């Protein structure tokens, strides 16, 4: 070779490097969740001629449920640390034995904006900026205001797999902690994935409503009524019935329940409710290239919706085989989100409901 | 006593995070560099006054898209970071960076920031954009998107050696300061 390159430390010391950064990073965290907590949310309960009961909902949501939940996990990585060859230290399981106790912070993300607009409002008024500066100061806090410090847990719950994949890259793949760093990384990756889901659901409810009132023609209840998810939609052949006629429909998977529409033949954004399928009541028959019994017809990239109970049967059609395929996901995606929800109870709010269908009333009925 | 937040946003791994280690320590570059960069205030001297320029990352938020926003509301400058050696994260500038935060925080100001000039000399880094018929960011290339996208201006820099380093941030102060108006609300 040549030896080219500047000065890296070794791969053992670059482990022991991110272990230290692991500890010292959460040991500083906690100290931001307790000056919060201790500088700001306990002084702001204490003056109730300033801030009412709602006021701190809003403004410190559960932070003080993510500083006990980040107590525990802190005491729980230093008994991993081993004091005598730091490198050897075996984090994985705590993230491991901990991973439901992150799903706090799907709640703190969620109204964080809310949190910000309250903030501002306040800091309009000279009252509210003192006594803020007074908190900080007497916490001892840097120069950083009060929004900034909260937007500290969201930070953190984006930077955990970032520092699990920097501990991965230096363990090798004999280390006791290998295999626990690398379904951490998974664990804590999948965490995030699912905060951002759940925002993005919560945030599309809206759109949800918008959409079902830009459709003609609507039959039947409110796709809210059942279902506040849109999986996957685009374009297939259908029929309906064994020697029917094949027409091409767009279709909207939501869970529970698939929508089909017919797009107007000149004007190619106006849609036609064209009825529904209870995606509960169907199983998916992945159908095999070729030629199918009475129904008697044959089939390029095709599948089929039997009823369980029944007899009843739909033949669906994709163009390309990427197609059939994406549309076999978002079937197998609507069971699994389905399952997933009524396990964990996950409901949408009246309140919900009642936000998203005056939204529609906003542009004219 | 008047503040600039300052919001590093781009994709993942191109050195946002080195870049504001190296701005705000002063390291031997043999040092091990953190993987995270906490929130950071420092007192800095403009028209002979103190101003607290609040500096914050945006490491491991590149695919977490309704996570990302949360960071922006009160933001009086940002940094669009890509890397000279990475052609995808310069696109990126372009596809999805200046679009989502000209979104959000329209009258906010913005630079375009090129990182890791050092690795334009690098051999591996050279090899390996080579195998793909690549070849790294010119700065006539950025400057002509700089201009296009309405970044006040582009700058380069290496968090490494420091070359460019003190002075995207002296650019990123002047941007906020030049004749709250221009300050990230509400979105």
Partial sequence: ?365 | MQTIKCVVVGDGAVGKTCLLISYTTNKFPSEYVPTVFDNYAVTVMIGGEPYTLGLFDTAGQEDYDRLRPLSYPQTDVFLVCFSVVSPSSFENVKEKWVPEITHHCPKTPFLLVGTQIDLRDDPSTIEKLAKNKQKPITPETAEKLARDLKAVKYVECSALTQKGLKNVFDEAILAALEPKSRRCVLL
Wanted: glycine share 4%; charged share 30%; hydrophobic share 35%.
């Fill in chain 1, 1 to 365: 070779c040549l030896c080219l390159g500047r000065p890296l430390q070794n791969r053992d010391q670059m482990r022991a490097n991110v272990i230290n950064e692991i500890m010292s990073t959460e040991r500083h965290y906690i100290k931001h969740l307790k000056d919060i907590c201790e500088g700001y949310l306990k002084q702001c309960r204490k003056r109730r001629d300033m801030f009412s009961d709602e006021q701190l909902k809003v403004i410190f949501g559960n932070i003080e449920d993510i500083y006990r939940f980040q107590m525990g996990f802190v005491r729980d990585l230093e008994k991993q640390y081993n004091n005598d060859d730091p490198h050897l230290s075996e984090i994985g399981p705590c993230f491991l034995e901990h991973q439901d106790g992150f799903w706090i912070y799907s709640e703190y993300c969620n109204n964080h904006l809310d949190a910000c607009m309250e903030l501002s409002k306040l800091m309009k008024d000279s009252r509210y900026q003192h006594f803020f500066e007074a908190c900080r100061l007497l916490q001892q806090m840097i120069d950083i205001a009060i929004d900034g410090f909260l937007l500290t847990p969201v930070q953190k719950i984006c930077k955990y797999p970032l520092q699990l994949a920097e501990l991965l890259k230096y363990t090798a793949q004999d280390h006791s902690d290998y295999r626990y760093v690398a379904a951490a990384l998974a664990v804590m990756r999948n965490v995030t994935q699912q905060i951002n889901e759940r925002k993005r659901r919560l945030e599309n409810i809206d759109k949800i409503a918008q959409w079902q009132a830009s459709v003609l023609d609507w039959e039947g209840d409110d796709i809210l009524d059942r279902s506040s998810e849109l999986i996957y939609t685009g374009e297939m052949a259908w029929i309906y019935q064994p020697y029917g006629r094949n027409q091409q429909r767009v279709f909207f998977l939501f869970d529970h329940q698939m929508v089909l529409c017919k797009k107007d033949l000149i004007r190619r954004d106006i849609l036609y409710y064209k009825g529904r399928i209870d995606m509960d009541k169907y199983e998916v028959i992945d159908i095999e290239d070729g030629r199918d019994d009475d129904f008697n017809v044959s089939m390029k990239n095709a599948f089929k919706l039997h009823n369980k109970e029944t007899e009843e049967v739909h033949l669906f059609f994709a163009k390309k085989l990427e197609e059939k395929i994406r549309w076999l996901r978002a079937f197998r995606e609507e069971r699994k989100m389905v399952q997933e929800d009524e396990k964990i109870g996950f409901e949408i709010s009246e309140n919900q409901k009642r936000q998203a269908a005056m939204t529609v009333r906003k542009a004219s009925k």
